[PDB]
């Protein structure tokens, strides 16, 4: 299924699914059908990933980005947020 852009390509992030979790689960008249990724770096004594998805509610597609702080020493996830895109 076209369930990402990866007909050979299956290489997952280790917080690119955590991220998806949240992005259907708070999206409750919408569906999640994307996992990209985006920047990403870390700093002394924390880190952060975030992604990219793709929600559909009714007919629109939309984007929304998951905020996940994590620790660089053992990824212990210190917190996480969510972010609507909107035009």
Avoid: C
């Amino acid at each position: 299924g076209e369930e990402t852009p990866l007909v050979t390509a299956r290489h997952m992030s280790k917080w690119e699914e955590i991220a998806v979790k949240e992005a259907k689960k708070r999206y409750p008249l919408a569906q999640v059908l994307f996992k990209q990724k985006v920047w990403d770096r870390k700093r002394k004594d924390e880190a952060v990933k975030q992604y990219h998805l793709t929600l559909r509610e009714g007919s629109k597609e939309f984007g929304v980005f998951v905020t996940i702080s994590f620790d660089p020493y053992s990824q212990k996830v210190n917190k996480i947020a969510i972010l609507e895109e909107y035009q």
